[PDB]
């Protein structure tokens, strides 16, 4: 919030260790898309294996970037989205990766 | 941009690199309100020596994140602000922060 009170390396560093793990950051870019069901994302995330992948939406779930409902249908069906502060994280993330972009643009363009 | 052909991963690591280095993120918000001769980094930063707030300055002028303005005035004076770019860095990194932010608040109060 840039607030004078808040220690930014520590809110930082917080902030990343919920999506610097394995295959968060494509979990998001699938999930920022649109809803998504277990098997579209073991289609999407080539080379994933069930087991990494409920981990890491257990994790994303808990640190409150996942939303997981269950629909009472016949069967069940289980439907993953972002949260909004799942959205919030992805727009910052894209931020970064746009600076990042122009950056290593800039150092290809000058070398 | 979220354009076709970029990585995002090592889009995003490339940013962090240019403000990881030890007293960068301190610098870079001492710059934020405008700009600083170098005694003024140096009382507000403690602990750091003239040689590596020298070295960082160096460093985010390097990479395009630091202005060096040169006043050929009597005597001659150096100031420090941030770029357009350095600016364009820093509220990504805020908005990063304040998520971190609302992370450590829920996180305390249960």
């Given at each position: 919030?840039?607030?004078?009170?808040?220690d930014?390396?520590?809110?930082?560093?917080?902030?990343?260790?919920?999506?610097?793990?394995?295959?968060?950051?494509?979990?998001?870019?699938?999930?920022?898309?649109?809803?998504?069901?277990?098997?579209?994302?073991?289609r999407?995330?080539?080379?994933?294996?069930?087991?990494?992948?409920?981990?890491?939406?257990?994790?994303?779930?808990?640190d409150?970037?996942?939303?997981?409902?269950?629909?009472?249908?016949?069967?069940?069906?289980?439907?993953?989205?972002?949260?909004?502060?799942?959205?919030?994280?992805?727009?910052?993330?894209?931020?970064?990766?746009?600076?990042?972009?122009?950056?290593?643009?800039?150092?290809?363009?000058?070398?």
């Amino acid at each position: 919030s840039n607030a004078m009170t808040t220690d930014k390396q520590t809110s930082i560093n917080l902030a990343l260790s919920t999506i610097n793990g394995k295959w968060k950051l494509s979990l998001m870019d699938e999930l920022f898309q649109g809803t998504k069901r277990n098997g579209e994302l073991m289609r999407a995330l080539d080379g994933i294996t069930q087991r990494v992948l409920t981990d890491r939406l257990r994790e994303m779930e808990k640190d409150g970037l996942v939303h997981r409902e269950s629909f009472n249908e016949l069967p069940p069906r289980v439907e993953y989205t972002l949260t909004p502060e799942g959205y919030a994280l992805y727009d910052a993330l894209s931020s970064l990766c746009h600076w990042g972009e122009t950056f290593a643009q800039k150092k290809a363009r000058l070398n």
